[PDB]
Write a protein that binds this ligand. Sequence first.
Ligand SMILES: Cc1cc2nc3c(=O)[nH]c(=O)nc-3n(C[C@H](O)[C@H](O)[C@H](O)COP(=O)(O)OP(=O)(O)OC[C@H]3O[C@@H](n4cnc5c(N)ncnc54)[C@H](O)[C@@H]3O)c2cc1C
Ligand SMILES: Cc1cc2nc3c(=O)[nH]c(=O)nc-3n(C[C@H](O)[C@H](O)[C@H](O)COP(=O)(O)OP(=O)(O)OC[C@H]3O[C@@H](n4cnc5c(N)ncnc54)[C@H](O)[C@@H]3O)c2cc1C
Lengths: 450, 450
Amino acid sequence: QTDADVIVIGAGPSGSYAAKLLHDQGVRVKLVEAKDRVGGRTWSTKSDAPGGPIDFGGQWIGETHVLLPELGAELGLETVSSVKPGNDLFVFNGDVEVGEEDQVPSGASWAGELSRSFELLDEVGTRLGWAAPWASEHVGELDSMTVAQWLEQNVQSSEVRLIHEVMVNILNGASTTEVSMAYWAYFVHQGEGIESLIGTRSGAQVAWFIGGMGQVTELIADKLGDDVHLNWPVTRIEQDPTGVTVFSGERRLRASFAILAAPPSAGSRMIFDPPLPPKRAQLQARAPMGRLAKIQVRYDEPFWQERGLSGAAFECGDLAFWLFDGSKPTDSLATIVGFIGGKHLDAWHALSPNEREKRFIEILVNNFGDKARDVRYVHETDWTVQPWTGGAPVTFMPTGLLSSAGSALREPVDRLHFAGTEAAPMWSGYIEGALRAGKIAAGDVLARLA
Amino acid sequence: QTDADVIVIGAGPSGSYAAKLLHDQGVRVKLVEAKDRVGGRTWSTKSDAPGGPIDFGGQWIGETHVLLPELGAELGLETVSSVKPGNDLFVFNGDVEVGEEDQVPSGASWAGELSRSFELLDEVGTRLGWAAPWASEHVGELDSMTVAQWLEQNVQSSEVRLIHEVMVNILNGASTTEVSMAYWAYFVHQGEGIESLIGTRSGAQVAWFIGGMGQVTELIADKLGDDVHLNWPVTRIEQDPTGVTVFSGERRLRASFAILAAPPSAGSRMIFDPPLPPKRAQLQARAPMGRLAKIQVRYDEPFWQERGLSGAAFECGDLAFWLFDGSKPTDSLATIVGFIGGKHLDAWHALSPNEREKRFIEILVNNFGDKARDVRYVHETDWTVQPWTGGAPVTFMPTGLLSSAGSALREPVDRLHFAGTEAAPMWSGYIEGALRAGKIAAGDVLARLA
Ligand SMILES: Cc1cc2nc3c(=O)[nH]c(=O)nc-3n(C[C@H](O)[C@H](O)[C@H](O)COP(=O)(O)OP(=O)(O)OC[C@H]3O[C@@H](n4cnc5c(N)ncnc54)[C@H](O)[C@@H]3O)c2cc1C
Ligand SMILES: Cc1cc2nc3c(=O)[nH]c(=O)nc-3n(C[C@H](O)[C@H](O)[C@H](O)COP(=O)(O)OP(=O)(O)OC[C@H]3O[C@@H](n4cnc5c(N)ncnc54)[C@H](O)[C@@H]3O)c2cc1C
């Protein structure tokens, strides 16, 4: 006797979507979540911050994402463009260089090497591919070196190296010395290439949902009602020939199938009986979360526009950030959003909380003008202290893992299927990846219930 | 109101010893253990195997270890020498080279480069030291490269490279492509150097306890009686100004202090409120267990002695092992013990269980003679599937961790102290390290109770 046909573990976008798809087909589903809320790495509030709704977690929609805007449209949400006209900045240890709209500065001496370094990164990624990078002829050697070592071999310009460093520390939440070059190259390729992922007004960053991204999982949970269990951290998965028992301490739920819709690092904390096969076990233990904080400051007006700036900036150097204008037309304040990750977040963490705030305002004053001192609101979400997540924005892998265990990202283990963005064939790391992996896992389980 | 003055988490050698020291001073202690037994990475049975007691986990005592033999003597255990006269083997993809006792073969062409490679490894280790390798001027650069890259830069001989590869894959349970050179160099230095750790009849490998190493923790648990809780996996640690609450799901124990006597990977599965400081959090999430299996075959007689062989062998190549004669004079059969780790264990895992057994016998036949076919008993302990351990013999670290978070191996966090072998100033990775770290943590807490 089963409590459900399928138990979905994790109420992020991936698990929420998988649960919705199965529920919509008349499958009996339970959606179990460790935290006191749904959303996972997505997390927003309409009312808690002055100036309008605010997203603490992921919030950008990409121009080639289709499951995410289609689901948002089905749930009654509306999008708005994130595209901000004006010059992006490229800042090198506080030395401001003004872009031409989203392009490198007019006759920057590093423009040509940046272009070549992006072509070479794309080419390395193409050699790996997204379907089976672990099976690629090139992968063993690339997976034995770090991104930092690849930069030392292939990049001469300090500017180009600093741009690559901010992008790895943010997009993977980890230092170029910590990430496998094979993992990085694969990651960027499977996100439609480097220009896709680093777009300030194109590629992965073009739109938002009015009212916050957390609405996606909240509206799904409303419809699932009593089949959602919060404060239900999964501690043990048992499997036998007829089903799966999922435990939260002594609390237990029995189903025919289970979908793990959480990162490999989440899986590593659970006890499996029988034990997982070896590649999946190594993958869970050795693919950690990156580290990222999201800092937001609100103001009366997007005063950066007085210098004709977009508010986007590659803030490069020892305390690197990716900065955006996060303002919506429906908001009553303007927002600057800054991301800081990996080794730059380690430095950020070494500062006192008051030093961090003062330092972030000094950056904004340097880049955007003195009106940056006239703050209305200052907030940080440090993803490293979020219980049952412990990092952001994504899973990364150190040397030797992708080539030896990557095939375990996607493969079911008996009656346990993997969703979560890390299992998506493309757009792993993104909400779109979360939905595609949820779709895949719901379809696989639905075929096994028929 | 407290259930105890101190809760010790983990009944390996480290936690068992810390609990004993506090208990012996009249401190009220609870010792909580996830598994259905004590011992952790130590695990033995006097009666379950034919031919005498057998150790599934760690069992060697080193010639410079003093807490381990002193504790064994206090508990009424007896030691026996593990030293086996005769020629050790050096085998390169099945090509047998016969040592002179424990020394390289007479006029081996690789003898000189092996000697130089050991001096250079020792020198790199000395530059880091054991007291604070994370603070060493050299550490950032060494911690940005793998052991494999250091071998490619410093070692020319295929034989020397294959010896280094079997030693890293066994002593760290991980591939030379996965381990930071800084972590490896530090690890070997803090174990009194490479010759210490690779001794077949000297250094770290000279003696055993008659009746098995599991006796150490079992006899401690007998005296602690009802203050030992088995099947009590810690899921949450909460701290406040007056004490520590330790949870196993809804079950809870309150004390004034807590000692975590388990690897950083064990800590990563627990939820901390308040959250841990950042370096300790990164350390727990990113310092994984190695992978190791221990294969044992018993025979009527140590037939290898008919060729004048000790039974020790560096079995090098694509399926590498460290082999020992594991026979005690009090045993009624002779034992060959083989360790296989890291990338060699990945290959081992890719074979069927029957292929693995056939392959191990073919190795023994090649090295030691045809009488290796006349088996009495065959057993494997795969440490990767042991619940709440998930690996062996030790914690390792990938690039970038030791230099950025290593200072969190030893430092208390408010009322939570760290024991476990990984916190030992020297002999981290070893039972001796486990006892020294338990001693340190019990002394620190005892001073705070006074
Ligand atoms: C600061 C930040 C900014 C980002 N920006 C963007 C962006 O702009 N665009 C984009 O596309 N993506 C972005 N992302 C990434 C995006 O948030 C993730 O790709 C997405 O949320 C992944 O969805 P998921 O369902 O696979 O996993 P998660 O969102 O991580 O959900 C996993 C769920 O599983 C739960 N869980 C964990 N362990 C257990 C357990 N033992 N028992 C039960 N439940 C458990 C977790 O609590 C969580 O709710 C960002 C992320 C962060 C951190
Ligand atoms: C195959 C093998 C051979 C080895 N050979 C040798 C050798 O010859 N000589 C040598 O000196 N060393 C050897 N070792 C290493 C030695 O076994 C370890 O260094 C030693 O056991 C470490 O002791 P420890 O107490 O620090 O940790 P552990 O032995 O790992 O004990 C930790 C305990 O914490 C428990 N625990 C984990 N998570 C939780 C939780 N959430 N709640 C409660 N409890 C928890 C575990 O179950 C475990 O019992 C070997 C190890 C292996 C695997």
